[PDB]
Amino acid sequence: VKKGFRAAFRFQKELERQRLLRCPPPPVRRSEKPNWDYHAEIQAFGHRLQENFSLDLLKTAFVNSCYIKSEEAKRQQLKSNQELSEQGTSFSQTCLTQFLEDEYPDMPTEGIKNLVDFLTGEEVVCHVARNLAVEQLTLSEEFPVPPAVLQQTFFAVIGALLQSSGPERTALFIRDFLITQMTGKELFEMWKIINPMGLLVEELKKRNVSAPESRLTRQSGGTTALPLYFVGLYCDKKLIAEGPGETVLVAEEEAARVALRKLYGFTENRRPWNY
């Protein structure tokens, strides 16, 4: 026995580290952990994003109906998010359509509707809300917060911000936290469509412009396993697009997609959003 105390203590801490890595505990919510006060943290959430909230409205904007159902279930042994949730979703959809119509005017209504649907979908809203301490302040039944509940609380936060400080401030909030999620992401990663050739031909008839001709401009290794077919889409012997592909069919599909991007204003070289 080597006498001493610090080496045994350091080894105990290292063993606790290995035990925590080997069989990690289930993720408990942050409110069931030390160093937590709900009121100071709601105030800091208000001051963090640089605006003002009415604190009672924000507290109601963080309370889910499933929490009431659960705490009355535990009671036998508060206002929900609802009107705030449809208020937030309605104003968010209208403001997102306004922003996407003011900057990108030539787009059709189906495309703008699908872009707004993407920006209010579960993926991007749950990505934004988990990085703004919404999940930590969310009062729900179970942990981790299911995506529908988290989206509902995020739009309840937007609605509480609306009722607190007006449509211009809420428009700036949506501009800074939802439009900014479109950066670096192309159109057809966002508005997923099938058969883009038919959509391009319909849109071209909408402008009273003749049907485009697919035309193999360039190519390399036509009979090898690694080709490069550059299918261009012409109209009156002037091209509207050109696109690459591994085979001629996917190249024509990509040329139609590039023509759709160029007609609607989602070129990769378009004007960046102004802030």
Partner: protein
């Protein structure tokens, strides 16, 4: 070295500078013993710099637990769930102040 170490690409949290800049730090948790020389400088921090530090940036929640600890701790939790626990053992008020500003500035 760099092959014995994980790497990442340069990125931000939620495109942190486009619309507005958001203070990426949520919390800070000093455990400052009432009697103990190791946290002595940290004690003076709570006497001197912590109120000015919090009034300089209201988005950060600061907890001074004041347990009979042996090594004091500042716990910086961030918006993306990261936790950085740093030892303010045997540090003066100035090194603690620079370390706390280091935690507050960065992502």
């Amino acid at each position: 070295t760099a092959r014995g170490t994980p790497s990442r690409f340069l990125a931000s949290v939620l495109h942190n500078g486009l619309g507005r800049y958001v203070q990426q730090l949520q919390r800070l948790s000093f455990s400052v013993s009432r009697d103990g020389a190791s946290s002595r400088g940290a004690r003076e921090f709570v006497e001197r710099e912590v109120i000015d530090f919090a009034r300089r940036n209201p988005g950060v929640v600061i907890y001074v637990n004041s347990r009979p600890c042996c090594v004091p701790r500042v716990v910086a939790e961030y918006l993306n769930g990261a936790v950085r626990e740093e030892s303010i053992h045997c540090k003066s008020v100035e090194e603690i102040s620079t370390l706390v500003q280091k935690l507050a500035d960065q992502s």
